Design a protein around this motif. Sequence first.
Motif, short mmCIF file in Angstrom:
data_model
loop_
_atom_site.label_atom_id
_atom_site.label_comp_id
_atom_site.label_asym_id
_atom_site.label_seq_id
_atom_site.Cartn_x
_atom_site.Cartn_y
_atom_site.Cartn_z
N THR A 151 1.64 90.49 144.19
CA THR A 151 1.33 91.90 144.46
C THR A 151 1.40 92.69 143.14
N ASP A 152 1.02 93.98 143.21
CA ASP A 152 1.14 94.88 142.06
C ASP A 152 2.62 95.32 141.93
N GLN A 182 4.40 96.09 139.44
CA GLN A 182 4.65 97.24 138.54
C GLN A 182 4.85 98.53 139.33
#
Lengths: 126, 129
Positions: B118-119, B121
């Motif tokens: 997943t993202d 960040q």
Amino acid sequence: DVQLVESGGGSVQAGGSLRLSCAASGSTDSIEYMTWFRQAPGKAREGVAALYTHTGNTYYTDSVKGRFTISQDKAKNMAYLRMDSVKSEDTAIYTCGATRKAVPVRFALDQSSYDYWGQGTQVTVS
Amino acid sequence: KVFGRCELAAAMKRHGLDNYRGYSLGNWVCAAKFESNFNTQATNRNTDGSTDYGILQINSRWWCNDGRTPGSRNLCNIPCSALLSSDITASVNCAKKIVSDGNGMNAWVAWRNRCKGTDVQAWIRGCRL
Ligand SMILES: [Cl-]
Ligand SMILES: [Cl-]
Ligand SMILES: [Cl-]
Ligand SMILES: [Cl-]
């Protein structure tokens, strides 16, 4: 619970090859390792080849390194043992094992690390 | 103690987790979110008599000693009680050993299921680190 079912096995000539299969079903989502154990006549069960399903990393007992290959089809909850260049000493009942816990690599060939077992399948090297 | 997201991000950054074994800081924050909901006192009993402890749900059969778990290996050489502290340090130092075992962060099921790929960040975005 996880059900494990082996297929394959039987007689093979020295130097020959056999493939064993292990199919998992049930609460398969949490499976961490799928691993092949064996028990030769008169001896204790030993870990042969372990596969960590979320990376594909594999771990082998010294006596089979280079000859046996464990692999998987994660999407189908399958593990496979390809036994090449078989030897006399490979004659044994082979049993699939699995666990739903993230066992440290150093304990991945110890039977007490495993929660689920197949039926065992005889392999006989002539 | 239940951490805030950026509070925990800053603490994890101070503990040197950013890029630890290749895993950017967001991975660690995300893992704590789904493992423990940022709760340092989270516990979960398992069917083998082990218990998962703390913000990163570290297990008492393999990693910490709680004195009541069959087959205890205590690879982190710590009492599991140390993993229920409001400061994250004992959990982090044991997590550093776990993630170094050979299969990365896959040790954490909640991370595999809700963070991996997943993202990640997004978990540190806005935290002014
Ligand atoms: Cl059936
Ligand atoms: Cl066996
Ligand atoms: Cl990974
Ligand atoms: Cl990140």
